[PDB]
Amino acid sequence: AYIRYTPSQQGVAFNSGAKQRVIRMVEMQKDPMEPPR
Amino acid sequence: SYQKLLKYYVLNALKHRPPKAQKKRYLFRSFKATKFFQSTKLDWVEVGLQVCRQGYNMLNLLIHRKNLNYLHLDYNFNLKPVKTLTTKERKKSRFGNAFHLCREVLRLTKLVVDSHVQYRLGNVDAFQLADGLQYIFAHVGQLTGMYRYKYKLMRQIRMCKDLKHLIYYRFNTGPVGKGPGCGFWAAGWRVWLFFMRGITPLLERWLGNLLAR
Amino acid sequence: GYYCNVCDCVVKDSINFLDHINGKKHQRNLGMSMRVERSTLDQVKKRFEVNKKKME
Amino acid sequence: WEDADFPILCQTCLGENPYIRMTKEKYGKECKICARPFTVFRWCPGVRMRFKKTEVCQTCSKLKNVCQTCLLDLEYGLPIQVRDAGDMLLKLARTTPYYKRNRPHICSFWVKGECKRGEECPYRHEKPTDPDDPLADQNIKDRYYGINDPVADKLLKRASTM
Amino acid sequence: MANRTVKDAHSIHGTNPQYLVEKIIRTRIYESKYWKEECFGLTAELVVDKAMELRFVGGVYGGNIKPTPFLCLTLKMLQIQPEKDIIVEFIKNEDFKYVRMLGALYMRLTGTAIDCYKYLEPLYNDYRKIKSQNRNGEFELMHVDEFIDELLHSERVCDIILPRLQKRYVLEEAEQ
RNA sequence: GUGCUCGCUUCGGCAGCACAUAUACUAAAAUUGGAACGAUACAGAGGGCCCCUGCGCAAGGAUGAAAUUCGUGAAGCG
RNA sequence: CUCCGAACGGUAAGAGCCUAGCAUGUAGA
Numbered sequence: 001a002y003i004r005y006t007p008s009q010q011g012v013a014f015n016s017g018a019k020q021r022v023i024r025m026v027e028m029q030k031d032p033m034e035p036p037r
Numbered sequence: 038s039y040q041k042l043l044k045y046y047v048l049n050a051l052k053h054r055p056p057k058a059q060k061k062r063y064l065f066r067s068f069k070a071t072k073f074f075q076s077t078k079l080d081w082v083e084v085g086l087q088v089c090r091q092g093y094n095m096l097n098l099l100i101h102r103k104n105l106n107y108l109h110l111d112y113n114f115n116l117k118p119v120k121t122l123t124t125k126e127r128k129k130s131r132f133g134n135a136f137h138l139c140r141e142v143l144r145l146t147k148l149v150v151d152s153h154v155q156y157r158l159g160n161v162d163a164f165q166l167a168d169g170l171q172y173i174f175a176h177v178g179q180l181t182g183m184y185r186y187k188y189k190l191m192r193q194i195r196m197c198k199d200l201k202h203l204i205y206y207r208f209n210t211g212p213v214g215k216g217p218g219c220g221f222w223a224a225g226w227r228v229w230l231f232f233m234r235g236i237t238p239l240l241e242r243w244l245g246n247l248l249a250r
Numbered sequence: 251g252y253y254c255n256v257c258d259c260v261v262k263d264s265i266n267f268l269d270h271i272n273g274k275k276h277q278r279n280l281g282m283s284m285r286v287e288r289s290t291l292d293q294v295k296k297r298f299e300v301n302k303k304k305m306e
Numbered sequence: 307w308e309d310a311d312f313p314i315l316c317q318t319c320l321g322e323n324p325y326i327r328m329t330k331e332k333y334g335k336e337c338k339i340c341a342r343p344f345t346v347f348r349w350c351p352g353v354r355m356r357f358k359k360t361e362v363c364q365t366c367s368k369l370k371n372v373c374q375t376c377l378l379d380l381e382y383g384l385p386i387q388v389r390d391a392g393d394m395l396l397k398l399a400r401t402t403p404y405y406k407r408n409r410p411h412i413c414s415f416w417v418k419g420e421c422k423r424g425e426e427c428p429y430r431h432e433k434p435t436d437p438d439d440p441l442a443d444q445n446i447k448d449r450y451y452g453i454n455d456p457v458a459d460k461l462l463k464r465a466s467t468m
Numbered sequence: 469m470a471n472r473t474v475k476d477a478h479s480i481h482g483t484n485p486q487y488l489v490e491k492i493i494r495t496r497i498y499e500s501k502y503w504k505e506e507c508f509g510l511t512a513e514l515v516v517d518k519a520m521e522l523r524f525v526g527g528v529y530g531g532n533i534k535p536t537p538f539l540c541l542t543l544k545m546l547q548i549q550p551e552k553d554i555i556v557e558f559i560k561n562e563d564f565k566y567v568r569m570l571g572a573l574y575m576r577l578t579g580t581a582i583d584c585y586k587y588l589e590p591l592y593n594d595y596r597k598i599k600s601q602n603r604n605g606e607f608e609l610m611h612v613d614e615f616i617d618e619l620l621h622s623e624r625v626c627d628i629i630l631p632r633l634q635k636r637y638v639l640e641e642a643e644q
Numbered sequence: 645g646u647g648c649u650c651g652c653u654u655c656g657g658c659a660g661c662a663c664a665u666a667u668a669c670u671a672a673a674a675u676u677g678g679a680a681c682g683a684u685a686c687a688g689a690g691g692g693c694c695c696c697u698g699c700g701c702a703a704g705g706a707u708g709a710a711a712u713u714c715g716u717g718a719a720g721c722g
Numbered sequence: 723c724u725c726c727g728a729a730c731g732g733u734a735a736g737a738g739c740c741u742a743g744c745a746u747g748u749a750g751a
């Protein structure tokens with residue numbers, strides 16, 4: 001006014017060794033010159 | 038004039054309660070920490086012309102987005118028409134609230150910057166420069182379009198009026214008694230600096246409210 | 251007043267009709283006439299030939 | 307109006323790399339098919355991939371059983387039209403999902419003729435596939451709903467030829 | 469359509485490709501009798517034909533701002549944005565006068581100050597007459613020196629505002 | 645790229661050591677389609693929601709969507 | 723005896739014809 005996620009969907013041979021697929025999650029910088037989009 | 042100056046001084050003396058609060062809130066210190074700001078060293082006249090061009094391009098794109106191809110800001114921050122539209126266009130150009138005041142402020146800023154650009158570009162370059170700044174603050178009293186958006190401005194303009202006779206009757210004494218004394222902006226520019234520092238947040242709020250729409 | 255047979259429209263003011271065929275979407279549909287700048291030699295032939303036709 | 311924690315993504319949309327790097331953005335980009343603010347996060351599926359993002363929002367995709375950025379499926383890998391009209395899907399699907407989706411789309415400066423970036427084009431230097439087949443012409447909203455797919459009829463007739 | 473040049477134009481650094489003239493004056497240039505004809509397209513060649521057939525050199529006339537065909541043709545060539553070779557060809561033409569006048573005026577509006585002195589200086593020798601339209605409609609015959617002098621030294625010799633050429637002393641101290 | 649091995653060993657080289665460890669709304673691009681209360685011709689006025697000007701949830705203008713009598717069923721009492 | 727103000731409360735509403743500065747950058751085969 002990191003994350004570890006087991007892909008329980010498809011893991012057989014996608015991504016050879018589709019073991020648990022860890023990732024990195026950052027946030028993107030918001031410039032303070034942008035009106036309401 | 039002396040009475041008005043003493044009046045402002047005393048009324049400032051009363052409303053002076055010890056300021057201690059806000060936990061040291063700073064601006065333009067977190068902006069430099071993000072990737073949306075970069076520091077450099079550039080001459081003052083260059084920064085002034087840059088700010089003037091940036092403000093003009095910001096207002097021009099506001100007018101462009103607003104689907105008004107029949108108006109033009111004229112590069113001296115004086116909004117001028119094109120074809121005299123009067124079917125329903127004149128009802129779509131009744132700003133009067135913040136566009137007016139932002140226009141006045143940027144007109145004053147670009148005018149000071151142009152007065153200083155003429156110096157480096159071959160103006161009189163003598164005391165004439167200070168005389169120019171003096172009569173520029175005088176015209177900000179009168180010539181500028183400040184009156185409309187806010188009327189309380191007249192108060193400080195009255196100071197800028199009274200303050201005038203604080204200098205000329207101390208400057209135009211002795212041999213120099215008639216001609217236009219150039220004087221200083223030691224008190225005028227001071228007043229307008231305190232003024233703009235005080236009204237930064239109002240225009241921040243108004244720009245936010247208007248950009249929301 | 252003025253009459254456009256391509257659009258079959260009646261143009262009233264002379265200026266109103268002048269500002270249709272020059273910009274008509276239907277007339278433009280009869281061919282894109284975006285004029286590209288000719289070569290530097292192309293602008294010389296028009297200058298030379300006119301010097302020999304108008305004057306001479 | 308719609309924040310989350312982790313995206314409901316595919317197994318091919320994530321990429322052929324066990325460690326990728328996401329970048330959450332609270333309230334970005336306005337969901338394609340319901341027009342609602344949601345939480346856009348992009349990543350790089352692999353080396354020389356397309357820097358894939360997130361289109362279709364959490365409730366948009368969770369309700370209709372579909373991934374947040376390709377609208378195929380989390381369970382099978384078929385479109386949302388084949389998996390509705392049509393079981394047959396299990397022999398129709400595929401394992402080892404081709405990474406021909408995660409690749410850069412065609413450099414238009416090359417199609418015009420002067421791609422100035424040379425060998426350094428981060429886009430892709432192939433010939434623009436001919437326009438004529440309706441697999442040049444699908445969109446998002448007709449895809450996401452069952453109504454009118456260019457793909458789903460062409461794969462649904464693969465289901466009764468042979 | 470009078471928005472873009474053809475499809476892409478090297479924007480003059482001053483204001484914009486088409487906006488080197490004031491917005492009011494260009495907006496007036498469009499809606500006009502002389503614009504209604506010849507606006508169908510004029511890329512490189514027909515411009516020469518339209519230029520040699522207009523023996524006026526002026527800007528605005530009448531209470532209602534009425535553009536001369538000289539001024540409207542300057543704006544038309546400005547929208548066309550011809551290459552520098554064609555402009556040097558117009559600047560080198562001695563037979564047709566007002567063509568050379570337009571070439572000089574355009575090279576002044578769009579061009580480098582070094583190039584301005586390099587191409588407009590040798591146009592400071594012709595002692596011939598040139599007709600012009602005053603603001604009240606009445607014409608006047610002046611010298612070509614007056615034109616190029618107001619163009620290179622003075623500001624707004626016509627209705628157009630000039631893009632602030634340097635003083636010649638700075639360039640004489642730094643360059644040729 | 646930079647500094648060093650009492651290195652193979654010259655001041656040509658080879659081998660090793662150490663510092664430096666992942667940017668990129670990727671593309672200068674590619675098509676796709678739209679709107680003035682704008683001039684011009686014509687006659688010349690009997691409760692809230694959707695918009696616009698707008699800084700104030702200041703202010704100012706507009707088209708579009710209540711009760712009587714009788715029969716029946718059930719609970720419960722002598 | 724030099725202190726000088728701006729916006730709204732304002733331009734009837736209309737059927738036929740016509741012209742245009744602006745905007746997306748993607749999913750997928």
Ligand SMILES: O=P(O)(O)O[C@H]1[C@H](OP(=O)(O)O)[C@H](OP(=O)(O)O)[C@H](OP(=O)(O)O)[C@@H](OP(=O)(O)O)[C@H]1OP(=O)(O)O
Nearest residue numbers: 168171172175198201202205209214215216217218219724
């Ligand atoms: O005419 P006066 O009542 O005697 O006062 C004038 C007048 O100041 P004010 O009208 O505001 O009181 C001038 O300003 P202008 O309004 O005429 O522009 C000012 O000159 P500055 O603009 O430089 O301030 C200066 O007059 P001068 O030109 O002689 O310096 C001044 O006082 P004096 O006339 O007594 O000097």
